[PDB]
Design a protein around this ligand. Structure first.
Ligand code: ANP
Ligand code: ANP
Ligand code: CL
Ligand code: CL
Ligand code: MG
Ligand code: MG
Ligand code: MG
Ligand code: MG
Lengths: 268, 268
């Protein structure tokens, strides 16, 4: 019989590979010591043989994927004008506007990559040939209720193509090649969101891995875009959660409490 | 005779490779058109042959360097408790405390990597053998007066070693191998800052590339560290500025106005 505090403690030390039961007869200290030893050996092995962080490693693999397929790598500001949020159609008093991390009077931490990538599409239209293909990977921020699938600080991949080839079939083809490369099974379901209209949601079971959009849409005019486009946004921590079978997305996050899904709190 | 507005416009279109003079007899529109054509061909070439962003590429090269030399790659939160800033000795009413980007009541955008890496050193001490070596690359935030060497949103590399081998000689040796790898000449000068005490500042001419610290220092006790350590922090945008000979650090920043030092504003 373990307390909730004892059960929580063993939960954070448990890893998906473990075949260890908390409802066995073994006392708490005996269970904690064995798990502590396992998590120490896991960090030791990483320290000796790999030393790469899962979230950084995935970013590098995704970067290579899209660069090799003709997409320009973008690194745009994380801190952006609050006015970009308005021009996306996210008015005040809308439920999405209350997820915005505001900074000073006129800036915020970006909740999405779309505004910056939209400016890059319009600007790069003066220089690059058809089609224009870009992508960015970086931090995004949303105030969220507590949940095993949501983080307030997460990492988004967003890619976009503008010009020729911007069909639903091509968008699904890119998504399929991308998730085939990561080795992640998925299905596509139609849904609607209140920024882009109807989207294609990329589902792993009931977990949304991505929302993809087939342009053009009326919002394009507010950004100086008048060509067809296709795009999608993926959550890297959600990709890692599925890939490594984490029960809670905190295991995949920028964190001081977990490293590659291994608890960093290895005290007794 | 060009106006200040005309001169500013040609300045942003000029690249360090260009051998073009603004005080020649050529009219403004003729100068702008030639530079616009050059910057279009530069983006075209990147789009066709490389497609990597300088800031992301440098991050990948630095990551590989430190991983190959036994340092564990860390990805920690960018949004951190305001209380971490206090425990670094940055009290209110101190000049450094007015550079902090505050978020909500109790959080801020990290102005440095030291607090998070200090927690990782203490936690990893329970698991990893001697010496413990870690590093992180990621965004940091400081309110700054306008200047050609400062950004409000920049990218910091910080590495640390804890345990044996934590001498000034070894710290300088790592710095030398690191900047030799990037191909950057530098000198080391003694200076003092009001968080760590005396530091070793890594200078490229008059531009500070890094501040390095030989522990132990009295601040260590506030973080649960009681072993010797050595560490340094580098600005990636400053490394790129020196490497590519940018006159203004805006050329090396996360930006919607420059890509790999090339203006994205290619209108007339
Ligand atoms: N708070 C979050 N934490 C982690 N990943 C997130 C978060 N919000 C969005 N993402 C990811 O980013 C992708 C694109 O953003 P978006 O489509 O706006 O999110 P979303 O539809 O609100 N997902 P959800 O909040 O679960 O209904 C999503 O499909 C997720 O994979
Ligand atoms: N505002 C900034 N913009 C760009 N790089 C910066 C900025 N602040 C610090 N850095 C870089 O981060 C390194 C480590 O941080 P730190 O030593 O605290 O900066 P610093 O001593 O205040 N440099 P400086 O403001 O020029 O006197 C510096 O050596 C710089 O290379
Ligand atoms: Cl997005
Ligand atoms: Cl630092
Ligand atoms: Mg949501
Ligand atoms: Mg969605
Ligand atoms: Mg300073
Ligand atoms: Mg300094």
């Amino acid at each position: 019989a373990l307390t909730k505090s004892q059960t929580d403690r063993l939960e954070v030390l448990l890893n998906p590979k473990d075949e260890i039961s908390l409802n066995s007869g073994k006392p708490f200290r005996e269970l904690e010591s064995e798990l502590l030893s396992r998590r120490k050996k896991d960090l030791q092995q990483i320290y000796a043989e790999e030393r790469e962080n899962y979230l950084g490693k995935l970013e590098r693999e995704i970067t290579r994927f899209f660069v090799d397929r003709g997409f320009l790598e973008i690194k745009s500001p994380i801190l952006i004008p609050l006015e970009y949020i308005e021009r996306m159609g996210i008015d005040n008093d809308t439920e999405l506007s209350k997820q915005i991390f505001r900074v000073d009077k006129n800036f915020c931490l970006r909740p999405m990559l779309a505004p910056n990538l939209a400016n890059y599409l319009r600007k790069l239209d003066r220089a690059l040939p058809d089609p224009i293909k870009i992508f960015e990977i970086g931090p995004c921020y949303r105030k969220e209720s507590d949940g095993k699938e949501h983080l307030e600080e997460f990492t988004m991949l967003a890619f976009a193509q503008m010009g020729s080839g911007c069909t639903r079939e091509n968008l699904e083809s890119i998504i399929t090649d991308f998730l085939n490369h990561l080795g992640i099974d998925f299905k596509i379901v139609g849904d609607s969101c209140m920024v882009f209209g109807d989207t294609l949601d990329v589902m792993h079971g009931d977990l949304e891995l991505s929302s993809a959009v087939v342009g053009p849409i009326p919002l394009d005019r507010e950004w100086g875009i008048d060509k067809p486009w296709i795009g999608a946004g993926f959550g890297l921590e959600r990709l890692l959660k599925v890939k490594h079978d984490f029960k809670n997305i905190k295991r995949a996050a920028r964190s001081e409490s977990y490293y590659n899904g291994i608890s960093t709190n290895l005290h007794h």
